[PDB]
Design a protein around this nucleic acid. Sequence first.
RNA 1: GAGUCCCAUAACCUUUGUACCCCAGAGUGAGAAA
Lengths: 64, 54, 121, 51, 241, 385, 109
Amino acid sequence: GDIALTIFDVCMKTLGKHYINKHKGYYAISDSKMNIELNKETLNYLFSESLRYIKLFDEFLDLE
Amino acid sequence: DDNMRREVQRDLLLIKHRAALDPKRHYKKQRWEVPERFAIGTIIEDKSEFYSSR
Amino acid sequence: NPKAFPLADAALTQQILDVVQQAANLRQLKKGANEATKTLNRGISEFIIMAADCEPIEILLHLPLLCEDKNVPYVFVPSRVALGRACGVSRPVIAASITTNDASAIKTQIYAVKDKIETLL
Amino acid sequence: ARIILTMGIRSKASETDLSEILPEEIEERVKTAAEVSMGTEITQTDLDNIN
Amino acid sequence: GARGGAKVVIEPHRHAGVYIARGKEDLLVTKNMAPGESVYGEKRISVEEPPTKVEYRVWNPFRSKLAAGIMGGLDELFIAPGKKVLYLGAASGTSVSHVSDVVGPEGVVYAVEFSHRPGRELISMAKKRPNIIPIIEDARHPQKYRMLIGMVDCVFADVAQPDQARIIALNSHMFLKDQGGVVISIKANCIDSTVDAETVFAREVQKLREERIKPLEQLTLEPYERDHCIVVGRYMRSGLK
Amino acid sequence: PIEYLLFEEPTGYAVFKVKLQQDDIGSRLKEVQEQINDFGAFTKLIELVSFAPFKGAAEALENANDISEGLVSESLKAILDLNLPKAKKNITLAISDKNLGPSIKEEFPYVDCISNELAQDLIRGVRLHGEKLFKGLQSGDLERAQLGLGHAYSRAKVKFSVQKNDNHIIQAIALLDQLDKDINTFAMRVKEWYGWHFPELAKLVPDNYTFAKLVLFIKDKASLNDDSLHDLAALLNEDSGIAQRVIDNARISMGQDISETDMENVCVFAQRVASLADYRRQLYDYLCEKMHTVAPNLSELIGEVIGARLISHAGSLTNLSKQAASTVQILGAEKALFRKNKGRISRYLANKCSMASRIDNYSEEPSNVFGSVLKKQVEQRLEFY
Amino acid sequence: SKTRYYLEQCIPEMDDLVEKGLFTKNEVSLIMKKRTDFEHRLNSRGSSINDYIKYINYESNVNKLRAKRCKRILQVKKTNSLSDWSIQQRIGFIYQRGTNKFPQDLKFW
RNA sequence: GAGUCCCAUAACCUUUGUACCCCAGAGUGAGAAA
């Protein structure tokens, strides 16, 4: 099941990347506080994404 | 409006015959029949031109 | 990359300052940044000369914006002390302008410099 | 004005819900215009005062 | 002459999108797209219509070459309301902003500029005028900004470079519509100072013919400027004969 | 020998296939040029095979930069890999830009690029008809995206920043005066409405803001307790003696009592005037903070509020710097911002304002060092005259 | 006109139906009359994707009716002739035209 | 019978009160002090 987890790893990197590009527009966010918020929203968006695969793993009984 | 307020009517009449207003001006030659669409406006000067053109 | 740009080398600076001295003798020189802005606004400026050592330099960085908009050549010389000396006034000058005149005796010398400034820019 | 209160920044336009303020067809319009906006970012100091 | 409180009779010009303000003196004006402000300190005229307050901007011929073209009597201007226009060499909003007024909300103006410093004022103007798309790029490589420009009905070139015949041509091929407009302002000193002004104008006209642009008209801009001529031409790809 | 055509839209990359090849020996003939205009004739030359819209605004700017530099973005590599067949013989691709050619060749050795006038003409037709060629496929609207991308591409190169912006200064000042006009006007109406119920207190507390607060406490004059006297004594100070005066006049006055509803509006209306004053104070701090960050030199020399006004008269900090020294003097000569010996200091101060403005405008991160020494210089002139 | 070319492509099918006896000549004419209106609708301006869906549905129904008159009259599961596979080929041809005309509509795909 | 639609919710003039001014304006452009 290592191959599946690798996809989860590369998945979790790029989804964060694009979510930064959105919620930012053409331009980087000057405010330090707002940038922290964007990092939060990525994280929270990424956790809500990560939690799904935990649910998915339950379906497969044979695997560890 | 068809009312043609006498102030506006006289206003245009001073622009038809603007050659005679001041003896030193002597504009070009033109007829200037009253147009069918026109408006009257007030100039606005720049704040930097307070002393020059206000 | 530096704010003061283009900066004339030694050989060119000598030729620029020479023209300034001749212009001052012929009453074709406007000295000082405030006069220079007035010449550009009236569009009578053959070209503007500025001191790259002006302290602080930003005080005359408004002229290039005028120069580039109106398409007037400009150049920076390293010394304000030298520029003031050639201008003939007894104080440093940070900016000077060469008034336009097609009847000038030093026309050929001016245009000789004007081409070189244009190449530098 | 109520739009500014609900969402402070074009970034917030994606997740902010304008249903109570605007109908469906209008609210999506500001969401699309938010991403392709010409205007520049502002500081929280400006946003707080505009609020 | 045109003092602050003085008031004028504004009536339309022969060209669409241009108006004449009469009085003791006559002023060329265009309707303000963004009322309440001046981009370079021109005089502005307010008219009360049923009542909303519209605003007209005074067009100074001595600052904008195109304006000097109107006053001398150019027969045909391809700039008109609801037309896409490409302006090359937009130093700042001194003349583009007037062009944006003529096209109106429906039309668009592509202002192209190279040097960053005058551009910064171009961008700040562009925010007030939605129908202006400022492109800070070199006009010598149209391929760089091909994403940003569609077909443009007219191409206006105020660029002061020695090799104008190439820039106007290259942008003409890519972006100008067939039978489209071309307006070029030519400064004799810049192209070649060694030869008289008349020779330069004849030379530039010939280049335009080689580049398939049939030239319709030339006008000299005096007294507003010395050694300037505006050449108006049509881009005829089918045949210039 | 053209077989595939690459066109780039603000929304995305479009790849076409060339069904028929127009005559090349006759390319300059009138007929073969007119057909590019005529949609019916053009549609028989090329047909759309693929179109990959950009994910969002951010990707459009990134590829808009890459296309300018003649590079192959990851999205562009994807679309070509899916479309162009693998191939002694090379599939021919038509591209508008020649600089893009070598990059495509590097990534795809099996494709040969073409950019002769034949390729330009087909690219010309694609741009001419635009969305019509997409057979109803969703391409957004090409005119709007160009406007967004155009501003995005320009300000990326020139490196605009929010720090430089001064429109906030022009706009906060337009609020500071308007608030003061309204806070005065509405407070004047609080005076009249509560004046009817008890005119004297308007005379007792001339300060309008205090009156709004004091009215908020003494709603109905009949309510008079020693404890209430201490409370209203806490408001402002008893040094003026208003605290004892109000109780005595409260006991005895010609003010006719008004209804509870009428009382309700006076306090709510008085509460409104309180908010405007409190907001105006909060704004006045914001302007002062922004003036320091935007124009520290000008703010230090003359002041935050006055310097903000001068920026408004000129219309922008850039316009103010561009002006000559003599013009700046008359820019503030209608409100005496800078203000025979008196005249000299004004003109002397007028120049030094222009000096500070230039430093502020063309400096990425202006400091206050030069504003200080400039002000000290003006001071030394001051004692001299 | 494009329409007539497509109509004549049907004729070898209609000939087979009469020869096999499945449909009478008057019935065969009615099918062609309905096709003539459809085949015209597709090629004329203002066509929408629904016109393709209607024509496809109509052709599918004709296939059912032929399939049943085969067992009812001929008493054969499959008559070895052109009529067996003409309709199924036609319906495929309608789809290829439809997707080219309207590549936006994902439902039709 | 009869102009809301040129803001009587207003314009202009006079008086009073407040804060200022008694220089030139695309201001000039090399003196000043002794």
